[PDB]
């Protein structure tokens, strides 16, 4: 029986996952109807093999929500199938170009002054007498909200309608225990966030400043020619769940309990700006916020020793790729030096590797810049607690001294 399942891995993953990606590399788990696939090698791959498909809603739904399916036309069904994330080519590869917009190299010109500002003054807001902080509150959580206003375009007067429901919608992803909100409840609220990015693009919602992502991806409706109205509502929806979701917390507050553990990183990171640069992709491998991600098979795939068959489902463990030593060598240490950070998984790869990439790692790399040049002495005030949650895991706590 898997401990992948046991609650008590959450905190330190790592030992469980270098045990099992030598002796049980896939192995099947019950509590996620999946098998786990835990290697550098087979994750890697597995993303980019087209024998797996990302239409999985289906049997996702099916396995953390038994005995309670779901018809073509319910909200749940009607968004997986027409966004990004739960689509193949060549639906997919419409459905990407149709946001173009927000992410082009002049758009992420534009987002990096905006990053770096608001994480300027995200820092420069602690007070002097502080010295003491959770970090998690007052940074971690901070940071991707201030990101999702003045980058994203998310209104701030519509932040006390989203945030609630983006953390309620995200119970789905909860990993192998029990479900925490029913499914009705995640349906209203999904069916809530399309209800919103309708009424926000006619204007009957907030102010969406301009030249941010959702600016750009407003002004870029009227020239779409191979998607629908509908299926914007719907990628806008997936949109704010990931602009909310503790993701970006997760990384923000990971990284600092990294710098934290490590004074020489600090150290490092003042030193040498090629030790900035990769701050952000060494913090993304050295803890995957998304800690597994969902595949089925639309063939029958031998991995790991294992056939798996078509119609079964795979738990790809981004988490456990990351610190594959086969990979990264010495995959504990956290390292700014370390010369193949950017190969981490934390993105995913291929077809569906994260749309918001390069405008997380700005976020990640100007926040660090801003925090370390004020507060390099930083370090642990207590213990740091994780969250109850191994799919999308990060600290709920992180009690820090700044100097
Ligand atoms: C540190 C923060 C984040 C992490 C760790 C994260 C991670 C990931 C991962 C692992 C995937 C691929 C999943 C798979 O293929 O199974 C993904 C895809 C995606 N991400 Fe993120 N992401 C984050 C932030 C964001 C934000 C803020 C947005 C808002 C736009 C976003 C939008 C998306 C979209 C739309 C996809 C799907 C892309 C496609 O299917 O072509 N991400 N992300
Ligand atoms: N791992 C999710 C996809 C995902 C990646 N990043 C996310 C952020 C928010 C919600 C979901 C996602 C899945 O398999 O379904």
């Given at each position: 029986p898997s401990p992948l399942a046991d609650p008590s891995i959450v905190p330190d993953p790592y030992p469980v996952y270098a045990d099992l990606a030598q002796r049980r590399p896939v192995h099947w788990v019950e509590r996620l109807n999946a098998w786990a696939v835990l290697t550098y090698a087979d994750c890697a791959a597995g993303l980019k093999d087209?024998?797996?498909?990302?239409?999985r809603g289906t049997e996702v739904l099916a396995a953390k929500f038994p005995g309670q399916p779901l018809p073509p036309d319910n909200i749940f069904h009607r968004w997986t199938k027409n966004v990004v994330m739960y689509t193949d080519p060549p639906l997919h590869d419409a459905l990407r170009r149709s946001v173009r917009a927000g992410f082009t190299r002049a758009a992420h010109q534009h987002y990096d002054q905006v990053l770096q500002k608001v994480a300027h003054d995200l820092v420069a807001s602690?007070?002097?007498?502080?010295?003491?902080?959770?970090?998690?509150?007052?940074?971690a959580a901070e940071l991707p909200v201030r990101s999702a206003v003045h980058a994203f375009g998310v209104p701030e007067e519509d932040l006390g309608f989203l945030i609630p429901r983006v953390n309620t919608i995200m119970?789905?992803?909860?990993?192998?225990?029990?479900?925490?909100?029913?499914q009705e409840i995640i349906l209203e609220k999904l069916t809530d966030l399309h209800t919103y990015a309708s009424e926000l693009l006619q204007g009957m919602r907030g102010k969406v400043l301009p030249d941010t992502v959702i600016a750009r991806l407003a002004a870029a409706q009227d020239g779409?020619?191979?998607?629908?109205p509908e299926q914007t509502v719907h990628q806008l929806a997936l949109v704010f769940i990931a602009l909310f979701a503790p993701t970006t917390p997760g990384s923000l507050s990971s990284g600092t309990l990294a710098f934290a553990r490590n004074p020489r990183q600090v150290e490092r990171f003042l030193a040498d700006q090629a030790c900035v640069d990769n701050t952000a992709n060494e913090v993304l491998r050295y803890n995957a916020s998304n800690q597994f991600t969902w595949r089925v098979a639309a063939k029958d795939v031998e991995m790991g020793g294992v056939r798996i068959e078509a119609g079964q489902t795979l738990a790809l463990f981004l988490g456990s790729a990351n610190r594959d030593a086969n990979m990264?060598?010495?995959?504990?240490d956290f390292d700014?030096?370390?010369?193949?950070?950017?190969?981490?998984?934390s993105f995913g790869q291929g077809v569906h590797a994260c749309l918001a990439a390069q405008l997380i790692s700005l976020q990640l790399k100007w926040f660090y810049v801003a925090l370390l040049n004020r507060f390099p002495g930083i370090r642990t005030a207590g213990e740091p607690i994780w969250n109850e949650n191994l799919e999308f895991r990060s600290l709920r706590s992180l009690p820090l001294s700044l100097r």
């Open positions: 087209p024998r797996l498909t990302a239409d602690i007070p002097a007498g502080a010295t003491e902080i959770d970090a998690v509150p007052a940074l119970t789905y992803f909860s990993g192998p225990k029990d479900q925490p909100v029913t779409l020619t191979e998607t629908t990264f060598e010495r995959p504990n700014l030096d370390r010369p193949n950070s950017a190969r981490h998984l």
